[PDB]
Design a protein around this nucleic acid. Structure first.
Ligand SMILES: [Ca+2]
Lengths: 89, 106
DNA sequence: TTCACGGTTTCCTGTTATTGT
DNA sequence: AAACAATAACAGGAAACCGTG
């Protein structure tokens, strides 16, 4: 039990969140919501803010890892889609 | 009107008892927030924003980059530089001001 | 008086550096 | 020695806020 939620890394979690989506892409906000709805540990960390230490870890994993790529989303608002790299770097 | 952040930092940088938490580096008008939480605390008290912290103070510093008031010294933690004409406002050179405040160089 | 504006303050998304496990 | 976690510095968009002219 390396982490509080199990042996999965953050990156493995985000991967599962994105793969769970119909279109194989989510916004950062949607990734946050998935974590809260889907990972028992995070179930009661829902109404917290981006300073949350684990939200920071998610942003941090999304930019650090080449397996995640950012894609722009249509109108105004309204942040990037996060998707897996077809190459998986 | 209300004092502006850059004027506030100047005020602290011209008072020698403030040197423990914010100081000139000795290179021009380059300065260091050596204790940024203490600097933010004072800024919060002065403006009556009790939740002021460095994260927020720094964001106001970042709006100054385009207004050529203050710039970041890249790769140096908490180091910034006035890039406006301070000599005219203060009536002193960097060298003059540094002597006055007994600035040990970095 | 009300109004519009500048200068933040607050929050956020995203990228990066560093240090501990 | 290499991966991952934790945490923070930093850039800059968006929008709220608020004192002043
Ligand atoms: Ca990435």
């Amino acid at each position: 039990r390396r982490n509080a939620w199990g042996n999965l890394s953050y990156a493995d979690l985000i991967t599962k969140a994105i793969e769970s989506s119909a279109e194989k892409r989510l916004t950062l906000s949607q990734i946050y919501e998935w974590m809260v709805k889907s990972v028992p540990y995070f179930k009661d960390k829902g109404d917290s803010n981006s300073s949350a230490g684990w939200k920071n870890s998610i942003r941090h994993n999304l930019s650090l890892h080449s397996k995640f790529i950012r894609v722009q989303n249509e109108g105004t608002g309204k942040s990037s889609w996060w998707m897996l790299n077809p190459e998986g770097g | 009107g209300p004092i502006q952040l850059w004027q506030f930092l100047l005020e602290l940088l011209t008072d020698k008892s403030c040197q423990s938490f914010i100081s000139w580096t000795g290179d021009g008008w380059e300065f260091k927030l050596s204790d940024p939480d203490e600097v933010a605390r004072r800024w919060g008290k002065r403006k009556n924003k009790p939740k002021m912290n460095y994260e927020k103070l720094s964001r106001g510093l970042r709006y100054y980059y385009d207004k050529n008031i203050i710039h970041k010294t890249a790769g140096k933690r908490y180091v910034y530089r006035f890039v406006c004409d301070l000599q005219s406002l203060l009536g002193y050179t960097p060298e003059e001001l540094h002597a006055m405040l007994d600035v040990k160089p970095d």
